[PDB]
Amino acid sequence: RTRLLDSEIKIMKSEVLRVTHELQAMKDKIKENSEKIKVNKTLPYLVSNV
Amino acid sequence: EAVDQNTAIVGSTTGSNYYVRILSTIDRELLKPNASVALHKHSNALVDVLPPEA
């Protein structure tokens, strides 16, 4: 009756990790792809040779 | 061409021809028909003689 409540509070302990890691995914991804939209609105995309 | 002392008329490897002056440093018998020449960018003036192809 004590370890199950410990796992219940550890579910929220992992949900805070879910919140912060989904933040490090999503809020950082908004940074990355807002910068990449800033690279995706240009004059050309200059053709070239690799 | 040099119209007088240290005022050149210089062709480039961008193709066109310019009209600048050269320094007080370079000896006047290094450009005697020509040279592979060293030019600045903003000042765009004659600096040095490159070693010829030989």
Partner: protein, 108 residues
């Protein structure tokens, strides 16, 4: 009877694996955002060794320059005939490369 510890361990597995993998692709794509520091170079070929620290490079559309190394780019490696990567602002040599030209030598 205590399968809520495995409903918490399964929440750990699923939610942490998904958020960690999303933030791992976000780590490598934050590194792709960090590539907005690695912003472009030029490439030319060493035409000669001017001085021990100077080289004449070949802009492939045009003109020829005077460059140096970064600091320790092995000035014996940069023989006339190698291809280098050139800086964008300073225009000097950044990184050596291989390659060479027309495949009529290669296809035979």
């Amino acid at each position: 009877k205590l399968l809520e510890h495995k409903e918490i361990d399964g929440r750990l597995k699923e939610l942490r694996e998904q958020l960690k993998e999303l933030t791992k692709q976000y780590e490598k794509s934050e590194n792709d955002l960090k590539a907005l520091q690695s912003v472009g170079q030029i490439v030319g070929e060493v035409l000669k060794q001017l001085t021990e620290e100077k080289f004449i490079v070949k802009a492939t559309n045009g003109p020829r320059y005077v460059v140096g190394c970064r600091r320790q780019l092995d000035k014996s490696k940069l023989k006339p005939g190698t291809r280098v990567a050139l800086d964008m602002t300073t225009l000097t040599i950044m990184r050596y490369l291989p390659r060479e030209v027309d495949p009529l030598v290669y296809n035979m």
